[model samples]
Target: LPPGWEKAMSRSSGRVYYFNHITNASQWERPSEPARVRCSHLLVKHSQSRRPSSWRQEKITRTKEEALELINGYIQKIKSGEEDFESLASQFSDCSSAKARGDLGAFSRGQMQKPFEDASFALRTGEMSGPVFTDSGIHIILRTE
Candidate 1:
C-alpha cells in the first residue's frame, strides 16, 4: 500500500474505486478515468486537502485520448523523488501554494469557481493531480501541505 491509497472496488460495477487511508471523505470517481487506468493517486473524501492549481488554472481538458500518455510522463519526476515542490512549481507548476515559487496562499471555497474548488478540496496531501479546468483557465495543479 502506498500511504493514502486504499484498495477499493467500484461499489457498483466492481470496477475499482478508491478511498484515502487518512484524509477526509473525498469522492474521486469519473465515469471516464476508470480504475484500470489510474496513474499515481492520493484520493477520497470531500473536505479541504490537496490537488493541483496553476499559478494559472483553467478547464480539465476534455481532450481524453492523450490523457494517459502525458499523465504518466507528467508525474514521473515527482514520483521519482528527484525534485522538490517549489523548484517544480517555478519550473513545472508547481497551487493555493502552487503559484508563488508559485502563489503561497489559498482562496475560500465559496470564492473560487466550482470546478477549481472541487478539484482542490477533493485531493489528499502530496498527490500530483494532472489538470482540471474552470472557465478562468487551465490549472495544472501539484499539491500543498
Candidate 2:
C-alpha cells in the first residue's frame, strides 16, 4: 500500500489495490459494523499510446540476460523485505502500473500485452517471475494466483 493507506487483494479479482481504510476520529468513536466495502475490479487496459516509446523501440542486445538481472534485483529486494512493493515499483518500474503498485486488477486473456499476459498467468500465487521484456518495458511479475 501507499503511504498512509491500507490495501487488500479483492476476493473476486485477486489483484491488490489500495483503499481508504481509516475513518475519522468521530467515526471511530461511534461503534459501527464493518463497512460494506464494495470491491470493484478496476481494469487498466494498456494501449499503444500509453506505452513508453524507448522501451518499444530500443531493442537491447542481451534481452534475456538483462531481463533476468532486472527481475533478480527486484526479487531480492522483495525477499529482503527492506522496502514496500509500491515504493520499489514507483522507483524502478517504467510502466504506469507502478503508480498503483502494479495493480492491474481482474483482466481476461488478450487484455494485456502478450509478454505480460504470458508471464503473469504462468506465475503461481505468491511467486515472482523472472523479468519479462515486452515492447513496453521489463516487467517483474508478482502473481496473486
Candidate 3:
C-alpha cells in the first residue's frame, strides 16, 4: 500500500477503484476507492551551487537553456533505456541528494512543491516528468513505487 491513498468505488459498475499515489495519470480515470501506494523520486535541478569570488553560493551561474538541454537529453536516453535514472541523476543533478542518486526520499500529497508535486504524482511507475520549471529552477523528475 502506498501512502496518501484514498479508496473509491465506481457508482455505475461498483468495481473497485483507487486513487493511486503512484500515478495520478489516472486521476481523471481513477478507481474511486481507498488505496495506498508510495512513490519515490529522483530530481535534476540546474547547476551545482558554488562560491564565486564574491557571489552567494546559492546564486546560479549556469544558463537555464544549457541545463535543460542536457537534462532533457538524458531524459530521452532514460526513456529509451540508454540511461539509468539513478546513474544519470548522480552524474548530472545539482541537488546534494544527487550523491544518493538524487533521491528526494518518499513524500505524500502536498508535501512537495506544487509543480514538483503535481508532476511527481502524475508520473506512472518508471515514468519521468520534466523539464518542468519550479522556483528552484528546472527539474527532470522520475518516479517509482
Candidate 4:
C-alpha cells in the first residue's frame, strides 16, 4: 500500500476498495506524431464508507453483454457532452473521488479493485471506455493516451 492509503483501510472489517484514475496522455508537441504517457491515481476506502449500496461487487454484471450495455449508455452520454465528468461521476459514481471531481492520484497495479483495474488498464489513451461496472458502480473511463 502507498502512503496515506493504509490510513483509509479498515482494521476491524478488513475490507478495502482501492480506486484508481488512469490517464494515458499523448504528446502534443509533435502534433502529427504522439507518444503515450500513462498516469495513475489511487485511493483507498473501507467497505463501510459512504457509497451507493446498489453498487456492490456481487451486484455487478458478470456477462460481457451486460457490461456492453452499460458501457454503451455511458458512451451516449459522453457523446452528447451534456454532462460534466465530475458531476456525472458524483451522480453516478460510488467513490469518494466523486467529491473531488473524480480525481484519483497515482497508483500501481494490484492496488485497485480487480474489476476497476481490468477495465481501466485495458483502455487506450484519449479513448473513452463503455460503462464498466465494479464494486462501486458503472464507470465511464476516458484515457488521455
Question: Which candidate gets the maximum lDDT versus the true structure?
Answer: 3
- Per-residue CA lDDT of model 2 for 25-122, tens digit only, reads 01111121111111111111123324433322342343445545665666667667976566666555555555576666665565667766655554
**Candidate 3 local lDDT, 45-134, one digit each (tens):** 445412211112355566667767776687778777898888877776666666777677667775767877766766656655546666
lDDT of 1 by residue, 90-110 (tens): 554323333345443444456
Which prediction has more favorable lDDT, 1 or 2?
2
Q: 1 or 4: which has the higher TM-score?
A: 4
Instruction: Please report, as a residue range, the 10-residue window in candidate 1 with the lowest summed lDDT.
Output: 31-40
Question: Residue by residue across 1-145, what tens digits does model 4's lDDT show?
Answer: 2211112334567554332233221221221112322322222222332342333232333444554464455456656787655555555444545565555654556766765655556554555444445554455665444
Candidate order by lDDT, decreasing, is 3, 2, 4, 1
> Could you give the candidate ranking by TM-score, starting with the highest?
3, 2, 4, 1
**Reference-based TM-score of each model:** 0.43, 0.50, 0.61, 0.47
Model 2 quality (TM-score) = 0.50
Candidate 2, residue 71: Cα displacement in angstroms equals 4.1
TM-score of 1: 0.43
Clashing pairs in 2: none
Off-target runs (Cα >4 Å) in candidate 1 are: 1-72, 93-99, 143-145
